[PDB]
């Protein structure tokens, strides 16, 4: 059955993405004297982790590794409704397991927040929702543009183009809203550590931006 | 109409480029205790933002996202005068809108200069004009060479080649003149914050270098 292989790839791709990506966010200076945060380290690991799982699993499951990307594909009629229910379930379970493994191997002195995304204290939930909506709009627009079969001018690696789109979103909004861009990436650590503050903006925000980018490309720019 | 889709893509591409690129320049240590400037973070975000909007909109509008690039295209007879009047207006509006959104979501404590380009105090306006002319000459030469249809030896991603050309210009001249390389990138924040010092070199500099690169390639090297 080709269906169960695609669902298993979504679980496995999301597990590795969350473990390696969240591991790079660990502060190794401890709670006593925290080390300066290296924004380039976090941005590249998140971006290059997506570029790798798209390369690995792109031909097996489609390489979504994002509940917001999966929702956009349903709206534009690229996957079935039943098919997309299992990707969302698999993506969430993979993130939960990936963060669970990170918590076990990390010494208790440096676990900290375990990479849970939080909105800036001086930034309202209204502004945090808007930031998540824009960095996710440009991520899903790149996916549709790169993977458009009518184009004849797409050159280079499609997986690496998508990876650099994730990185620039992180280089911008790590200090604003955590630069989630992914509902399942935020769901994982929250379940483990039990941090549920302003968690509704990481579902409405990314999903709203994903639907606009998919609908705007498929129905307005390149119909 | 295919024209209004190209003008709309130039407005939207320039909006996202300005918001994400200028956001990476925010100093989150505040005006009290500024944090050290990370030059690689700023260079990569500017470079990877251009590589992404070329990938997204390259087949829709031509992927100029630069008033200096559009002027070079007109001189070499690649777009009409009427077509290029609307791209420059759309690019300028997108820069204004993109910088305005950044100012709304950014706390007043860290807004600072909002990414406005400024010439070094000890560097004369004559030197600043020359610096802008050289980093823009090599950027427009890359665009013409990568997009040359007579070539048969171009390999890899054309969008990614252009992005790394924007990065090296930033790795050099951030501390000299701010590394504009783009008249509309400097026009945006200046309108919002009202900082208009030495603003004529960010139009004369980039435009002269772009025309030299376009004319030299199209009429001397590869006619």
């Amino acid at each position: 059955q080709a269906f169960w292989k695609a669902v298993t790839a979504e679980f496995l791709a999301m597990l590795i993405f969350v473990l390696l990506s969240l591991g790079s966010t660990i502060n190794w200076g401890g709670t006593e004297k925290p080390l300066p945060v290296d924004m380039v380290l976090i941005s590249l690991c998140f971006g290059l982790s997506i570029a790798t799982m798209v390369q690995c699993f792109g031909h097996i499951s489609g390489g979504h590794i994002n509940p917001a990307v999966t929702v956009a594909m349903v709206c534009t009629r690229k996957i079935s409704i039943a098919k997309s229910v299992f990707y969302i379930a698999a993506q969430c379970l993979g993130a939960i397991i990936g963060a669970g493994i990170l918590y076990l191997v990390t010494p208790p002195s440096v676990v900290g927040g375990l990479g849970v995304t939080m909105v800036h204290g001086n930034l309202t939930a209204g502004h945090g929702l808007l930031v998540e909506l824009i960095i996710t709009f440009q991520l899903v627009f790149t996916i549709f543009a790169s993977c458009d079969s009518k184009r004849t001018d797409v050159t280079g690696s499609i997986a690496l183009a998508i990876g650099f789109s994730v990185a620039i979103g992180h280089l911008f909004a790590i200090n604003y809203t955590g630069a989630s861009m992914n509902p399942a990436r935020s769901f994982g650590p929250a379940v483990i550590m039990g941090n549920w503050e302003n968690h509704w903006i990481y579902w409405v925000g990314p999903i709203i931006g994903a639907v606009l980018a998919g609908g705007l490309y498929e129905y307005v720019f390149c119909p | 109409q295919a024209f209004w889709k190209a003008v709309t893509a130039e407005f939207l591409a320039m909006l996202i480029f300005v918001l994400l690129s200028l956001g990476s320049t925010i100093n989150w240590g505040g005006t009290e205790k500024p944090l050290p400037v990370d030059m690689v973070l700023i260079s990569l975000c500017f470079g990877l933002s251009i590589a992404t909007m070329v990938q997204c909109f390259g087949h829709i509008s031509g992927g100029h996202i630069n008033p200096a690039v559009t002027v070079a295209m007109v001189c070499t007879r690649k777009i009409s005068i009427a077509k290029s009047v609307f791209y420059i207006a759309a690019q300028c509006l997108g820069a204004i809108i993109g910088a305005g959104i950044l100012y709304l979501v950014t706390p007043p404590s860290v807004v600072g200069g909002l990414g406005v380009t400024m010439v070094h105090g000890n560097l004369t306006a004559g030197h600043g004009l020359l610096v802008e002319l050289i980093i823009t000459f090599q950027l427009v030469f890359t665009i013409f060479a990568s997009c040359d249809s007579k070539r048969t030896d171009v390999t890899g991603s054309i969008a990614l080649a252009i992005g790394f050309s924007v990065a090296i210009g930033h790795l050099f001249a951030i501390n000299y003149t701010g590394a504009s390389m783009n008249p509309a990138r400097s026009f945006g924040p200046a309108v919002i914050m009202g900082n208009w010092e030495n603003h004529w070199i960010y139009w004369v500099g980039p435009i002269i270098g772009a025309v030299l690169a376009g004319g030299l390639y199209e009429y001397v090297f590869c006619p």
Partner: antibody
Amino acid sequence: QVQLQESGPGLVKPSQTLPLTCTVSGGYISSGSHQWGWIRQPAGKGLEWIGRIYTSGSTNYNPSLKSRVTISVDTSKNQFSLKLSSVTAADTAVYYCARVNYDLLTGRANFFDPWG
Amino acid sequence: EIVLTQSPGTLSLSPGERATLSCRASQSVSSRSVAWYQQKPGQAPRLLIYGASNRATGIPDRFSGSGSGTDFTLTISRLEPEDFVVFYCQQYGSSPLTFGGGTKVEIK
């Protein structure tokens, strides 16, 4: 220098709300790197935090008081207000409005100088 | 939440002696994030130390604090007639903010 002055009824029967207002002089709420919050001190006890607010309108409340506390900002008149609901005899105290320091990177509330 | 305990409950000395106050934290406090306040009975509190080692503007040099981890101390070189008032210790290394219990100083 910056100065703060409270204002309120001073005698509330049980089960109503407690409106208090703090007026700032010598400094501007909008133009600055400070938040503004409230503290109280029940008779014969220690200081207890209540909440804060920023010029952007974002607030943080004490977890034990998050349900009843409500704080708003009026930058036009340079004031911020408090609204405590379902007051009870245990809420008797001396209420202060201070200027909360904070850290730029995360936006969390630091020490509380000056006081009202 | 980090629970702060201040001992002794009351501290007695003659004028001129050295007074030392202890604020022990139930959990590690990040980046030495502790501050001290002094309240005159019937008056608004006052800020003395922030960061456990930095002194506020205009505070007499006889006030100094130090410490780290889960133990911080406030020490007064020489007492004064007006220094026999309550003292509070605050921690802001992890939300929510919490205060101490208070350490009254009385003339022996």
